[PDB]
Structure formats: structure tokens, C-alpha cells
């Protein structure tokens, strides 16, 4: 399914540079170059939870050669967007490698000029929408989704980045109630609401409780994936997480942090504040050592079977009349 | 009109605040400092532009009281676009100031994550055509107009940048032609078709001859409005533009250096050549007194005239059926 997927790419970076127009050709040509680099390397898991969801929710009758078509560009669109975010997320968190490979704007001649090249990655989702899904009847709301998730995302990177001052100690600002508010909007509806979602509208499932139902279960999965995310930042093996850690250097807040803070000492509480928020390779170790004298990795293990045992029970409660197969796939993909 | 048009933007500013979910308080809070800050202080013609458009082409029978606030609301969108793609565009163009005061980039406290607060001005014009023209007959074709015109300035800032590479002689890049595709692409579409074409479908004018005879007429206004920019971005009075110039140091295909390069001498090439392109104050002052010596003031001047001329015999090819005061009062602004 993912060779699948990942096949599928060839033909959306050949719509999307027809329009050669001779006069726009270098721009295309780059716009070539931002999507080769920046959409290619990952998982794909976002993009895969629309095309998985899509066969699951539609009647195989209905599930056509080209229906199948604009469920792979859709998933593809929700690449893109990820694409447009992680790009300009490199920027601003100062971060070396993505995918294995450097951060598009460390590229010599790339720089701040990656800003354009993610905006129209962005631009890309809706040009792929019209090409494909513009007589569809789930058109408007799937660019209304589009839309919404990436206001949502850019809200919660605006409160990511708030509680996140450089140079500026900010543990007081760092607990349980600001960093659920920070994930849910800056993560937990791009990666998971937004993929059902899509695949619910291309399905015809329209209704407001359904996808309120649906929304319940995934804004928790995705909760618990940048919990997830923010261990491994620190505690992730760099050969699989394909990205080098700043979340202590860029003053984050972290659930790592954040669980410091409530189990750290006064004396502890100092060694914090001395060293977080820092670029210095020693300062960043304190910290690190912090979090192990403290069982961070033990509490992380526990949280993530609490928080599995959870979403099963929110899953048994809310997925009806959706198949629960589809909760259950996503699950299985995110604890693996 | 343009002090009803400013007022107009307390109302924006107000809907956009209101979705205070006490949770996303602090980045709707930062939003509110990024509208205060980034569409406010600047002339104000292509929001107005749209709302004259309006009264022009609309039957006054059909210009009730939310019909225009409808249209106050979508020249807003259009400046919130303007001010996306500014607030990106003085980053990457390493500008100091714009409107009178330092770029957003440039505030303390700011700096990189400026891009957040850009691509959240973009969001701002969907969810403010949701709030406002949702139920509208026009509501499509205006995400798909702010849409299209994104992509197309995004299309733009590409070849911009790429004819413009930092640290490297780029003077056989800088020919008319691509200057001519440039400013299509990067101003044209959102400056002066966008607007206008905004006007005519909300006065139900979709006809698809029609939106092409409009963009014969607007594409070439944005490119004078272009040249213009170019022109006075050295030549013009900073207390009245509001900004300082970069384009000799950023390395620009600037209407100056086309028209240079094809009035110097080859020791005039070799000049520009050694001067061109770098952040030196001395070096930018060889290029200046060059332009000055090469009487680019004179050129552009009658350029201005003979621009003007073409312009008016178009809106006499292709206005109809629309009324050609609709053109004259944008040429008025962009000529005065
Ligand atoms: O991939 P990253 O940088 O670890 C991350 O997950 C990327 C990201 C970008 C945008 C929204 N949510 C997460 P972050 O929040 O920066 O820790
Ligand atoms: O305001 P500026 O920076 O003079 C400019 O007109 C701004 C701009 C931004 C985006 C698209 N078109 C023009 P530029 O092209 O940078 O010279
Ligand atoms: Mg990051
Ligand atoms: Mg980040
Ligand atoms: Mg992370
Ligand atoms: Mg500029
Ligand atoms: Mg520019
Ligand atoms: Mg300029």
C-alpha cells in the first residue's frame, strides 16, 4: 500500500508541472525540486489513513479507477500540507536535518527563500483539489477542511512559539493545560482529524455528530503523537527518527518539560532553569541527565499504555456507525 | 471612502478576535497585534478597489446594508493578501522598513516566526469569507480567485528569487522578457486583476470572455505599477514610500538594471558588474550614479506617459460592457 502510494507521486508531480507557459518554466522546474525534496521521505502515514480510510467508508461498487484516483491525490494534498508546515517549522526551530537529510533551507542557495518554496507547497493542495475533485459533490467542504486544519495548525504554532521565547526562561508558563491546548491545535487536527475527515466527506458522510464522534477519539490520538513526538526529540534514535532534537535548546514546551516540572526538586527546579534554553552542547546534557535521574523514559512507557487503554475506550464509545477497523489501523500505526 | 473603508477593519479585527475557547487565547491575542500592525498604514487601493468596483457594477436596488458589508469585508481579503505576502516578501528581501516603520520581522521579539504570523494573515481571508459570503452564489469563485492569485504570485516570487541569486552575477539573467514575466506573475494578478475580478463576480459578472478582456487591461496596469515600484524603490522619496530600497544590494532584475543594461557601454557593463549586487553603500552609489548618468529618470518618465497612452486604448478595446470608469478611476490612483 505504501509502494502504492508512493507511485502515485509521479503523477501529481507531472500534473502539477504541465502548466510549462514556457515563461513560468524555471519556476516550475523548482516548484519540481521543492516537491522531490520536501514530500518524499517520510512515512507517508497521513497521506496512506486517507486512501486506507477511503476503501473502508466507501462501498466497493462506488470505488471506480478514478474515484480511487482523487482518493490518492487527496491523501497526497495531505502531504503537501504537512510539507508547507514542516518546512517552515525547520526555519523557525532552527533544526538541522528532516527525513535524513539536511533541512531544505540549511541547502546552500535554498535559505529564507524556503519560505516561498513552502507556501507553494501549500498553493499545491488546492491546484491538485481543482484538477481532480472540482465536479464532486464533496468539493467545497474538502478546500473548507483544507483551510481549517492549516488556521488551526498555524494557531497552535503561534501558541507553540509564545511559550517558547528565546532567551527567555519560561517555566512558569510550561503545564499540563497550556502544552494539551498547544498539541491539540498545532498537531492533532492536521495529522489525524484531517485524513478521516477528507475520507468521510469523499464517502458522504457528512453529518455534524459523526464527525464530532470521529474528532473525539482522533484530536486524543494525535495528542498522544506529540507526546510521542517530544520524547523521541531527546530520546528518539537518530538513524529512525531521520531529525536532530532542539526542543531544549529552542526553550520548548516539551511534555518532557513539563512532567520535569512536576516531579522535579526545588534544587532540581534550579538546575532547569539554569540550563534550559540554551544552545550550549553541556547545558543541553544537564537537562537530559535531569529527565533520566528523574525515570522520564518510565513515565513515557507508562503513559503511552494509559493512554492506548483510553483511546480503545473512547474507540468503543465513539467510532459506531463508522467501522471501528478504521480507528483500530491508525492505532496500531501510532503505537507500533 | 478610504476613511469608511479603515473603519471598517475595528469590525474585521473584532470577528477574527472572537473565537475567544479561552485555550487559543494568547496566539488570538498575537493575532490582533499582527492585523494592528501589518494591514494597517498603507494607501489602502487594492481593498478599495473592490468596494468601488462594487458600487460601480451592482444595481444600487442591490446594494443593501450587508451586501456592503460583504464588499467592505472582501477588500480586507484582498489587503490581508497584500499583507501575507509583504510581511514574507521583507524577510526574504532583507528589507527594514515598510508603511513608515521597521518590518514585522525586524520588532524584537519577532524575527523568524514572522512566518507564522503571515500564514495565519492568509487564514484570515478564508474564514472571513465563510463568515461573510458562505451562503452567497459567488462564495467558490472568490476562494478560487484569492486562491489562484496566491499561487500565481507565489509562481512570481520564485522567478524573482531565482533571477535574483545572493553573491552571484546574474546581469545576463536581466532581460526584458523575463522582467515581463516577473511582474506578471508577482504583482499583475493580485494588485489589479484580483480585485476588480472579485467585484465582478459578486455582481454575478462570471462570464468567462468577459474576466479576460478585464485581465487584458489589469495585467498590464499591475506591470506598470511594477516598473514604478522599481523606479522609485531607488529614485523615490522615502518619507513618501515608506520604505527603503534593496533591490540594488539584493541583486533584483529591477526595470532599472534591464534598461541600464541595454543603454551602457561595455565599461559601463563592467561597472554594473563590479557593483551590482552587493551590501555595500559605496558599490550601491556607483550603480545610482550610473542609472543618473544613464538619464533612467528621463527614461522612465516617458515611459510613464507612453504606459498611460497604451493603457487607455485598451480600456477603449476592452472594457465594454463594463463601465470604462471602472478602469479610468484605477488608472487615475496608479498614474497620479
Ligand atoms: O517534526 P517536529 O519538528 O519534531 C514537529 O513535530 C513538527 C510540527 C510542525 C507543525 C505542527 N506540528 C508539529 P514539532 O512541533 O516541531 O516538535
Ligand atoms: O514592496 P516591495 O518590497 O517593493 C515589492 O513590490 C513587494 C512585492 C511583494 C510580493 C509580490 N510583489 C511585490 P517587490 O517585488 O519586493 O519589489
Ligand atoms: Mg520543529
Ligand atoms: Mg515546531
Ligand atoms: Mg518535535
Ligand atoms: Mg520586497
Ligand atoms: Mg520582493
Ligand atoms: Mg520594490
Redesign the interface.
Known amino acids: 500500500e505504501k509502494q502504492d502510494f508512493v507511485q502515485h507521486f509521479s503523477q501529481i508531480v507531472r500534473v502539477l508541472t504541465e502548466d510549462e507557459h514556457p ?2 518554466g ?2 516550475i522546474a ?2 519540481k525540486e521543492v516537491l522531490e525534496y520536501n514530500a518524499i521521505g517520510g512515512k507517508y502515514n497521513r497521506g496512506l489513513t486517507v486512501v486506507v480510510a477511503f476503501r473502508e467508508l466507501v462501498e466497493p461498487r462506488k470505488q471506480d479507477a478514478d474515484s480511487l484516483q482523487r482518493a490518492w491525490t487527496v491523501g497526497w494534498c495531505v502531504e503537501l500540507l504537512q510539507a508547507f508546515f514542516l518546512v ?1 517549522d525547520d ?2 526551530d532552527s533544526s538541522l536535518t528532516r527525513r535524513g537529510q539536511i533541512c531544505w533551507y540549511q541547502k546552500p ?1 535554498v ?3 524556503a ?3 513552502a ?2 507547497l501549500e ?1 499545491c493542495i ?2 491538485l483539489l ?1 484538477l481532480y475533485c472540482r465536479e464532486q459533490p464533496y ?2 467542504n474538502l ?2 477542511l483544507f ?1 481549517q486544519s ?2 488551526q495548525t ?6 507553540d ?2 511559550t517558547a ?2 532567551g527567555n526562561v519560561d517555566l512558569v508558563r510550561f503545564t499540563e ?1 497550556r502544552y494539551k ?1 498547544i498539541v ?2 498545532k498537531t492533532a487536527f492536521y495529522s489525524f482529524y484531517l485524513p478521516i475527515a477528507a475520507a468521510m466527506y469523499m464517502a458522504g458522510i457528512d453529518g455534524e455528530k459523526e464527525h464530532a464522534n470521529a474528532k473525539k477519539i482522533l484530536l486524543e490520538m494525535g495528542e498522544f503523537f506529540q507526546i510521542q513526538d517530544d520524547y523521541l526529540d531527546l530520546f528518539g534514535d537518530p538513524s529512525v527518527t531521520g531529525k536532530i532534537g532542539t526542543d531544549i535548546q529552542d526553550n520548548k514546551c516539551s511534555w518532557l518539560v513539563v512532567q520535569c516540572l512536576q516531579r522535579a526538586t526545588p534544587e532540581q527546579y534550579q538546575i532547569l532553569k539554569e540550563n534550559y534554553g540554551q544552545k550550549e552542547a553541556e547545558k543541553v546534557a544537564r537537562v537530559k541527565a535531569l529527565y533520566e535521574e528523574l525515570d522520564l523514559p518510565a513515565v513515557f512507557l507508562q503513559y503511552e499504555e494509559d493512554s492506548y487503554s483510553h483511546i480503545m475506550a473512547l474507540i468503543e464509545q465513539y467510532a459506531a456507525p463508522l467501522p471501528p477497523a478504521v480507528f483500530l489501523g491508525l492505532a496500531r500505526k501510532i503505537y507500533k
Open positions: 515563461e513560468i524555471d519556476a523548482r516548484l517552515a526555519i523557525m542557495g535559505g529564507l527563500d519560505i516561498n518554496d507556501n507553494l498553493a488546492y491546484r481543482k468539493y467545497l478546500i473548507e483551510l492549516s488556521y498555524e494557531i497552535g504554532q503561534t501558541l512559539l509564545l521565547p528565546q493545560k491546548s491539540k491545535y
